[model samples]
Target: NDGSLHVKKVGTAENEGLNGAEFVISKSEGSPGTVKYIQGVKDGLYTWTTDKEQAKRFITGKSYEIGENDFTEAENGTGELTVKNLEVGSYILEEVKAPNNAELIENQTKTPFTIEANNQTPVEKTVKNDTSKVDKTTPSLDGKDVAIGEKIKYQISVNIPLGIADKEGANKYVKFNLVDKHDAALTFDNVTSGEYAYALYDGDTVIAPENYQVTEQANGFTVAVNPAYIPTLTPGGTLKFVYFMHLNEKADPTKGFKNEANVDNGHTDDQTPPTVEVVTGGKRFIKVDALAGASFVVRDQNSDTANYLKIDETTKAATWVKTKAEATTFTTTADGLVDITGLKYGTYYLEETVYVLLTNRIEFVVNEQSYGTTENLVSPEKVPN
Candidate 1:
């Protein structure tokens, strides 16, 4: 007998969180027949394929036909099949048939389902394992072995992950180059002897170049460094160097899936640098008390200057240091008062500069206004010389 069974489920309507319900087609009274196809009406429909090979795995087990369907079903067998924990939406079941030669019609009813759970129920669990072993090693260097100003070099070897090397190629190996503040390259041989005291470059800008340091023993890559030309670094001296793998392609689609892409092109060079000016306390002629406190105010035209200003009382210097302020609306404004106070009877110099990263550093010097507690002070003429 050729027959057809239309299965429908009811539960949550809209696509909520993890709470939802599904329906399956089987042959053992519990579930029967071949679930030929299944679909979601309001949303999109997905068909279920059931060849002999495909049905073998799901024949006995209940295969989930729909995902996050919203239909209602009863607890007792009042309907064909009932499912709990369904999302909020309308759902329909279709094309439930027997094997190719046989014909069987089972449940053909619209059932109402509910996803109501009491007080507390365990919904999800995550299992994590730590398989890494502790790395134990003897002290490589005794405290008294190295001296100040003495240069030392060492050959370093590191293992590269096979998966990463296959994806990025041998060119992604670490680079060994030493550079100074003047962009001068220091010698990098593995030997320890010459004018070079201790050579090391900043670690933040190094990029993986070609493979001059790849190994074949399945061990790892190695890089040599000469110590005689580099200086013996102090306790707190910084070792400037960068260690990172280079990506093969300019854009990675897989990275987009995990949202782990680097998106910095360094466009800050187009911005206009800040400007600083020192405003004399009052009119440029008033002879205030030179021995007493003489106040002065600093003004920045570009908003960037306000954030980078630094005042030093000990050295009598004021500098515009780099800051994290990236807002263009942040400008320097006097709180109706100057930044200086009591002054000595001498000419004071205030140094101001504009800093643009990787760009030119512009500087300006301004002298403090003189002060005197004497008769009426004559204002200086506006000389155009």
Candidate 2:
């Protein structure tokens, strides 16, 4: 009676099917001495197929040792190979070639097997392969502006490689670096998970709390991931990282508290930083003229508002004092863009045209406050000729 046998080739990780793998199958001869390479008779299981079409099946009896390519490995998971019309007895199976770029690290000897009336005993061979990985981080906010000593929440990102297992510590221990500037501007705050928290992606579907920790350094902190269930990684794997920062009172509004960071290999990445906008008590005066590009001098004659003090017209000495008193020649400023700060609320007249000129009689008002806007009493159209 004729019996059959089957071979299942696989990798260590889950759903890992390696392609271009080879196996050598051998058993005792019927009566002669021994059958070397039993070139498969009919081309059924030993074949390669794709969207394009099936390639020619490999010819058997090619001395299983000098074995030819019979079955190709699967792109994602393990695959099978069968040998039929064999004598109902014991046989020897060995992995000749591992998946392309992979090696046969484990069980690879004369793996014993029994051929039954039908294809019964299935031999499983596991192989070892190298995997790749990718990673990143991002900081987001509701609005850019934040008061000093305020807290901001930032959610960053990390990931699992393509062939990673979806189990605790599957992606196994990873770290991301951070950089910070401006001493008082940003202070870490609102510890939801104390310092920070972490999560892993189960194929962009669900997020599992793998876990994480933070190590404080000089400029910033290092974000590390803990896999309670997953860390196994490669070229396409992914996970998430996050943190909190507090804006300090001394944070400079002019120099944004910008930062920098990156992942392990420094190849591909997910990274960015944020800034806090400092808020002030009062407003500054903008340089404006009824005529475009026309230069005008603001005279603070009331001794109430500040004064245009210097003779230097070229340099914005900011030399203008709060009270000009009796002024001579004041430097001129153009269209209300470059402005004046620290204005005291008051109604003042144009010694040199308080603000805009119909002629010179019009007055400007401190009109608004917490110390707000200044009003030009007369319009250019209404100016007397």
Candidate 3:
């Protein structure tokens, strides 16, 4: 006996050590010469092939206790073993057991190795296993309130799942699947070029999609974030993206507009759609006049500066009104009424701006979500003399 064999068992997916790997080393195949294999038998998966008692009776040469189910474990987190005392011959190695929820390999499936005193190095082989598996991820949305006709931004947030590794030999690359779908309540905002502006953020850095595609489906638009950049991402990282669309039409005043999103890679998924609610843009306004019969022109908008003006008497649009005299001011009704019909959710600044009411020059955001609970009105009353 002048030869030895060394075996290493590792998780192939991540290329790491594996414990609790069991194997049977024996001379099964027709060998260059039939040799006695190192024999260790056990009752359990982790029980050593040879215990302290068995070790005491060990023989130095051709030493072993031949037994049924002769097994040994790859422990020490190195998943490696060395067997000495073998005459030049062929050997068969087989996996009797494997790590829980894991797999095994042996001399590349009982492959043979020959040894001679001339050989300075020991025989070597790698048995592989993998721990990487499918996992589930969660999806979310940023529900900042938006008004009708305004550019509303939709933000989707997805958390990266852990335990990502290759299934076979070296994983050259990975694949990623991320998608977002919406309800019919809102119109996708687009440029004159007819392209929707979409952006992706990996953590805080904006990562442009290298291999990607965005297409509009019948229900909504579909977005794909390529995996070319996935390897660069830290495990369990965050991925967020944003897109703009107009809330031109009104949703169920009570239910509002609901949006849905998804994050999946076939094996992993947040199957349940995450949703966000949006409301209808209001065009009606209430006047709280306190200047006592002091009638004034209620201009839907400021003709010069487009900011402080919008009226929907028919345009269903928000207008700007200011303290200036040139701006068109519609005479008020009995209740200081500057009635507008076409004001789709907009900014009605006493021709003022975002807040045109409550004695402030700010415009009013006819927020769709603020309905039933809040009223739109302005009180530009005079001071006490």
Best by TM-score: 3
lDDT of 2: 0.40
lDDT agreement of model 1 with the native: 0.23
Q: How many residue pairs clash in each candidate?
A: 44, 48, 40
Candidate ranking under TM-score, highest first, comes to: 3, 2, 1
Per-residue alpha-carbon lDDT of candidate 1 for residues 20-138, written as tens digits (9 for 90 to 100): 12333222111653333222212322333444233212121122233334222233321123222233333333223322211122222122222223412312211111011111111
lDDT-sorted candidate list, best first: 3, 2, 1
Worst 10 residues of 3 by lDDT: 55-64
Q: For candidate 3, write residues 84-110 as lDDT tens digits.
A: 545565655555556654533323335
Residue 276, model 2: lDDT of 33
Off by over 4 Å in 2: 1-143, 163-184, 193-210, 227-237, 265-385
RMSD of 3: 12.3
Residue 333 displacement in candidate 1 (angstroms): 29
**What TM-score would candidate 3 get against the native?**
0.43
